Amino acid sequence: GNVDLVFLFDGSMSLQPDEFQKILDFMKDVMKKLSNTSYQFAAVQFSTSYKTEFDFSDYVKWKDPDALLKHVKHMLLLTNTFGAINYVATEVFREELGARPDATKVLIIITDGEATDSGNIDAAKDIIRYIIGIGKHFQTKESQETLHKFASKPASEFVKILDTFEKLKDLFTELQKKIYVI
Amino acid sequence: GNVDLVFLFDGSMSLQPDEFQKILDFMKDVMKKLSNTSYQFAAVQFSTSYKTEFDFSDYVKWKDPDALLKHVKHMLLLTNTFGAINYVATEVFREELGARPDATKVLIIITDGEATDSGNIDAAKDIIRYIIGIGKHFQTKESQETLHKFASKPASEFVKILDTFEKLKDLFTELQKKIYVI
Numbered sequence A, B: 001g002n003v004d005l006v007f008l009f010d011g012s013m014s015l016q017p018d019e020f021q022k023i024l025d026f027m028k029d030v031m032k033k034l035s036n037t038s039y040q041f042a043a044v045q046f047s048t049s050y051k052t053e054f055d056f057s058d059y060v061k062w063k064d065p066d067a068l069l070k071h072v073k074h075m076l077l078l079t080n081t082f083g084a085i086n087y088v089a090t091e092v093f094r095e096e097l098g099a100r101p102d103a104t105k106v107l108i109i110i111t112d113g114e115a116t117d118s119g120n121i122d123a124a125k126d127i128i129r130y131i132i133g134i135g136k137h138f139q140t141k142e143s144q145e146t147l148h149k150f151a152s153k154p155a156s157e158f159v160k161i162l163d164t165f166e167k168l169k170d171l172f173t174e175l176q177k178k179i180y181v182i
Ligand SMILES: O=C(/C=C/c1ccc(Sc2ccccc2OC[C@H]2CC[C@@H](C(=O)O)CC2)c(C(F)(F)F)c1C(F)(F)F)N1CCOCC1
Pocket: A003, A005, A030, A104, A106, A108, A128, A130, A131, A132, A157, A158, A159, A160, A174, A175, A178, B180, B181, B182
């Protein structure tokens, strides 16, 4: 039925300007494609700290991804993935910020680095979690494995390793082939 | 996996010019929303006779509903629904027209009247059939019932009756809420 979806995007220092924008363009592509549906969106940038760039209430008032993401500034710091998953779950998935109690919860994590913090993601056990690991930092099997503990299972379904930020376009192509009425 | 979908739309004399236009506009609204997906479309006008206005191969090459339908002329005759469905099954879902033999076949039938011919639609048994009945001709339970034999079962899932042609907007709104990735 209803799907409240949060994009949790990396704003670490490793990300070049163009790579950071390709993340934004990807999220905007998706949101545009799925306007006027049972989907509701929010977005949070995570580096060292966390910022709700816009929440569910904001999406419903605007329904305009371009406008909604126009204040994003690249944090340019670390990659605190654990703290960021917990921040989404405790501070973003809230009825007080437009979330629908009924809805299927989905989290899309987009990163170019291994996490710099630690802990657990117990607060997010009730959320379907996908993670996109992009670039050279994820060349090895071991690097790719570290990303599993953040995502739902199996990794074959919920973990996607992309070789470049151009490949975000290919992923948008792939997903659209999975868009169906019903 | 792939979905091959035909719009089989009514061009009977009973349709006023604006009503005919609104069917054309509904079809374009749907296709535009499902662009760049696993859906490929064909459109076929039926009254007394039948015409393929564009085929699947036209859609793949142009991906432009506006242009693909720009040359439709309202037939202004009868409503031979039986022969029309039969024309779709045997003449439209063909490699020659860009049909993928392995795909899921969908037929959307849009009509404002009861069928003027008879016979059977046994040739369309492999096709998932939806029928939209529009207007005052479908005021009675009885008249809406006459459409059941053309649609997949049950009628509650595959038959929709609309009071007016303006209500095509409302069906467009409803259907988009049923759009999902997966
Ligand atoms: O809405 C979704 C998921 C959407 C979704 C999922 C992943 C993703 S991205 C993703 C991340 C990790 C692995 C795969 C992924 O997608 C592969 C494609 C093709 C395969 C599909 C599948 O595994 O069924 C997924 C898409 C997205 C995204 F990113 F587009 F935004 C989206 C988004 F675009 F929609 F948001 N549902 C419904 C609830 O159940 C889960 C799927």
